[PDB]
Design a protein around this ligand. Structure first.
Ligand code: HEM
Length: 291
């Protein structure tokens, strides 16, 4: 099963920058969402879950098909809450009906990271909508109540290694858990709509206490009012993971570089880019444009 990137007919860089700008302007505008966190975090969670269904063994799932738009996938329990990012992006698809669904979903994650002051994330167009019967079954995304062995195995399905797994998990500096969505409740840090190395710092520097939440699930809670999932806490339980956690706590630029490569790879898993496709695009922020 091969998925070959196909550029939207006649579109170039400047066209996609417009779609970026529209997402970015709307991010600016809808600042009240989720108690003033804004929609940045749910947008990067949506781009991760639509890519996270990939299976490297048979190339099923992945971001290419746009299959999150079908009821079997948006009804995935693992995706509870992400209907809000989809709803956000609907006016944008309306304004730019020529972009594919996979391209829009994935571009929404890139746009969110950069406007929340994270690193630049190169992005490539050419995902093509596939039909309903290519929608992967539920159950392909990761459980939160497991340990580092589980996490390591899980991410190997996505062809991610130790550094990649730890870099990628740093996105949990953003947003928060919601009891009615996941059975977990609370934020990971204080600046949860700015992209920083705070997750790593909080992991190492906080006083964590293991507790049961109101949904009867175990989670780690700090005196500062922060939390960590069991899978998050894994990263300082495994010695290999802990080494890298310290690295990123100590050096945000290194974390930024590694996240950037890892997020692009995650969003492009399963896609074949022809030799003569366009080079990855690096979009300007609104700020960089005076907008
Ligand atoms: C072992 C892997 C991980 C587990 C078990 C997992 C689990 C969770 C859980 C349960 C939530 C809260 C959902 C809610 O209640 O609304 C959460 C949210 C979040 N996750 Fe993860 N996650 C994983 C990895 C990742 C990765 C790789 C990324 C992206 C690069 C990511 C991005 C985020 C973000 C940004 C949110 C916050 C969204 C918002 O506030 O609504 N997660 N995750």
């Amino acid at each position: 099963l091969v998925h070959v990137a196909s550029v939207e007919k006649g579109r170039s860089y400047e066209d996609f920058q417009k779609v970026y700008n529209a997402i970015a302007l709307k991010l600016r505008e809808d600042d009240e969402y989720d108690n003033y966190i804004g929609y940045g975090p749910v947008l990067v969670a949506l781009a991760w879950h639509i890519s996270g269904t990939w299976d490297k063994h048979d190339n099923t799932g992945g971001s290419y098909g746009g299959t999150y738009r079908f009821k079997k996938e948006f009804n995935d329990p693992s995706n509870a809450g992400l209907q809000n990012g989809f709803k956000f992006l609907e006016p944008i698809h309306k304004e730019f009906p020529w972009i594919s669904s996979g391209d829009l979903f994935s571009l929404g994650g890139v746009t969110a990271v950069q406007e929340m002051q994270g690193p630049k994330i190169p992005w490539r167009c050419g995902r093509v909508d596939t039909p309903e019967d290519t929608t992967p079954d539920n159950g392909r995304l990761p459980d939160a109540d497991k340990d580092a062995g589980y996490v390591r195995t899980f991410f190997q399905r996505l062809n991610m290694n130790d550094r990649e797994v730890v870099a990628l998990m740093g996105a949990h500096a953003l947003g928060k858990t919601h009891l009615k969505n996941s059975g977990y409740e609370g934020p990971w840090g204080a600046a949860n709509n700015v992209f920083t190395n705070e997750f790593y710092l909080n992991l190492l520097n906080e006083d964590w206490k293991l507790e049961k939440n109101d949904a009867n699930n175990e989670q780690w809670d700090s005196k500062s009012g922060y939390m960590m999932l069991p899978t998050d806490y894994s990263l300082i339980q495994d010695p290999k993971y802990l080494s890298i956690v310290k690295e990123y706590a100590n050096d945000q630029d290194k974390f930024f570089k590694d996240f950037s490569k890892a997020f692009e790879k995650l969003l492009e898993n399963g896609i074949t880019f022809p030799k003569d496709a366009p080079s990855p695009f690096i979009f300007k922020t609104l700020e960089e444009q005076g907008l």
